[PDB]
Amino acid sequence: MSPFPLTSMDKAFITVLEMTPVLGTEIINYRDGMGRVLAQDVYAKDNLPPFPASVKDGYAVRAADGPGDRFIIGESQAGEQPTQTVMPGQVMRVTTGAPIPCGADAVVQVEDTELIRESDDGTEELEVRILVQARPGQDIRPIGHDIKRGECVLAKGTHMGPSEIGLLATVGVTEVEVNKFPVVAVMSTGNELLNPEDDLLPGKIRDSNRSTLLATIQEHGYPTINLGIVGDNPDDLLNALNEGISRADVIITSGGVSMGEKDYLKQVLDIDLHAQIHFGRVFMKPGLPTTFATLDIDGVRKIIFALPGNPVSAVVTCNLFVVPALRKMQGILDPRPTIIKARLSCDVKLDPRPEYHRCILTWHHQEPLPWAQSTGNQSRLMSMRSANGLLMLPPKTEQYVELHKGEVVDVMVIGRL
Template sequence: MASKVEVPCIKVAILTVSDRCHAKKAEDKSGSKLRQLISENIFFPGQVVHQDCVPDEVNAIKEKLLAWADSKEVDLILTTGGTGFSPRDVTPEATREILDREAPGLNIAMVTSSLEITPLAMLSRPSCGIRGGTLIVNLPGSSKAATECLRFVAGALPHAVDLLQGRMDTVEVTHREMQVAVAMKEVRDKASPLREAPPSVTKPHIHRSNSLVDETQVANRLRKSPFPMISVAAAVDIVLKEADMLNTHVISYKDALGHVLADDVYAKDALPPFPASVKDGYAVVAADGAGNRKVLGHSTAGSKPDFGEVIPGHCIRISTGAPVPKGADAVIEVEQTELVKSADEGRTELEVKILHPPTIGQDIRPVGCDIKANNKVLSAQSWIGPSEVGLLATIGVTKVKVYKKPVVAIVSTGNELVDPGVQLKRGQIRDSNRCMIESLLEQGNFEVIDMGIIKDTPGSILEALTNAMEKADVVVTTGGVSMGEKDLLKQVLQIDLRARIHFGRVFMKPGKPTTFATVNTEIGKKLFFCLPGNPVSAMVTCNLYVVPALRKLSSRLRARNTIIKAKLGFTIDLDPRPEYHRAIVSWVEGDDLPVGETTGVQDSSRLLSTRSANGLLLLPAKTDEQASLPAGHVVDCMIIGRM
């Protein structure tokens, strides 16, 4: 089972060291940028609890560092500025004076990584260390350099803070993840030892993978997955925890379908804005009772009235939705009247007979009976469907603030794959995964980008994932996550993209090698769902993990899939793993529960097993006590289509 340990939020203080910024002669861009990165959880879960600016003076710097570190309210202090060669660059000296212990590894990591960007990094003099339970890190003064140096060490900072704060449960989880990474690296090192590049080799292209795997060393490939097996429930919990709601924007009501409202919506006007007739008939004075009435004119919806006030003994012909004229307090439907007198060969009514006495208010919609002016019509977090779009139009709200919906990039991996329209050659198969997943997600009203098919090489995978990450919030891949020598996705994610792989195996059938990872970037967190290549596995796991995550990113209140009870329409032998059995679910007349009928052979490569399937029957794992389930047995069923 996966650990349920929560990732603690690091309490951060930011200190800008600058004479000019302190004197308000320059803008504190570095401090503002660091605050933005931390507030948006770009590098780690963080919260800025203090921020200040001091001049380049040792005592001023020391005073602020001591106050924050000794308050026991701050986990991490980031300073920016004062680490260079200028006579007034004294931040490292001031920092060292108050440290209990130094942390030179952080200094080395920042300077070494910075040297790959500019040789001038050798002139940087950061000092990092510990005071009490607080970690202090010196960063350069420029916004760009401060951001880069923080990125270089950010991966180690949460673990360092956990150690300082004694959070041993979180420390143990991190150690287990490191052991997985080490195990994978050991296998890669055996497969392809590091070799020094000849002097003529130039700096690699940004999409050149750093993977150390020699794909020709098949015998030395990894033979056991280093990733622990977790349950589906634990996997779903992890996915939803990592899927943060996206930002908001203002759009036209016509484009709002499928979005979630970010603000409450209020009616500008009452509905109806005037007393309106419910039926076609005559507006009358109720006190007149039954009997003959002279017709003064007519009132139709949207037209200018050709009459004055209704007086006793008279009436106005009126249509459904039209304004009820002054003086009238009831409407009598046309079916309850008789024509008495007409003119112009029947074109004009002069007098009618009311057959039944009306009551006051009969068939009249009073002002605001549907919606009162300034009433809240839709609440924030409401999902906008067709009816909600109609409501927005009705109350005249043409612009609404909504949460953005995620953009999803879909990639298929596999040397054997070709597009559907290609004539097959020996060893090739047509790619059905992209169009299937694209249709599944578009059915949920999500925007999808088709990134095509990529080859099973580290460089191709890195280039495709990098491009997808730039264009989308979520990247969905199929294939390349099992134990074959060409299954390279996990290592490219870990080594090249520095992704955090949250899980790499799930106890389920089909879909065991499903992998979920996240990458923190300066423009936000990116979610990676690496689904198995078998079409059925891809479809099932997309429903289980991707669809709920997209709902959560869109700010839907109910992100999880709908689960109902259903009866088995067949007898089935259970599998050692919990199975998600494709089924056609329908109600039988007179039965209290729907019945799930199998779609046939459930092999993960057999796409026919998904045909007409609208449910996944959640079958338990086989045990010594229970090896099969009989027809009529009640199980949970996940709804994935129309019933």
């Protein structure tokens, strides 16, 4: 209760995912579907193609006519239903995607033909030599070849990207049920903090955590609310938390959670807000004082992350705990982060705690594993790259105390790549 027990990193992570709710559903326009999870199955109400369609530029023929010289009776062009029937000894010009006319049963691509006659002005083809024996149905997509009416084309639980949006467009299902996205409120606490826009005053520094955290959350596509800087005292913290609860599904605070003139926050969460603190310390480096609470009001579960004030600790813990919770809330069935294998670019000393650090992942020519280079430790160009990984290093053992350059380690992906 104070000091809260040290919670293992594995227990803390499982606890967050177990206790975090899945948000309810809403209907959206399909164009707004990026990153959403479907909460319904989606069915085709038409065939694709809905008419027999040519695969090629060429001619719709009767296969039974075989090769030979044919009169061209017209053309079938994309977008128009032909009105003519192809009779023996005749063909119709077709383009890719055009409907196959009545009377024809195959398409012969233009490369397997030679033109015999055209109009005097050259605009219309009149007679063509078909050089091959068409196979029945060749170069035609029959009705429903790609999608059948009544086919389920997307399952509930699908996490949508551009191709899924395109598939919704294809089948004309322009309104879909999806899980809501979490609204995430972020505040900072500490009497030393000024806004980024402020000149410094004695004893003060600028608040960076709000900005870093909001940007991290925005990067993942979730709506955010900036609740500003809150004074480190019980009344102001309670008011800010109540605003967060009212306005958002998730409240993130940073600061006020180490031991000292600080645990107003853990105290306010418990005694004033009546929230359930599930852990208040985690055996990790950085991130020791990380706190996770839930609050149930009238059948709704709010989640509260009280992150360390240290700016590095705040951003590491946001990636380890907050992002997976948000993924679960927005309906992603397996909300775990992507963890990949990479080679260390430098030796690193291990701690009794599992340790985490921002890094850059780079592939080197034809080498199969990427290299991971911890940020902050210098070339010019590499010192400029934005972090796309979080090194996840194991606790030291009486055996292994140090990992060396080249050795394969776990890296959580936190940026593109």
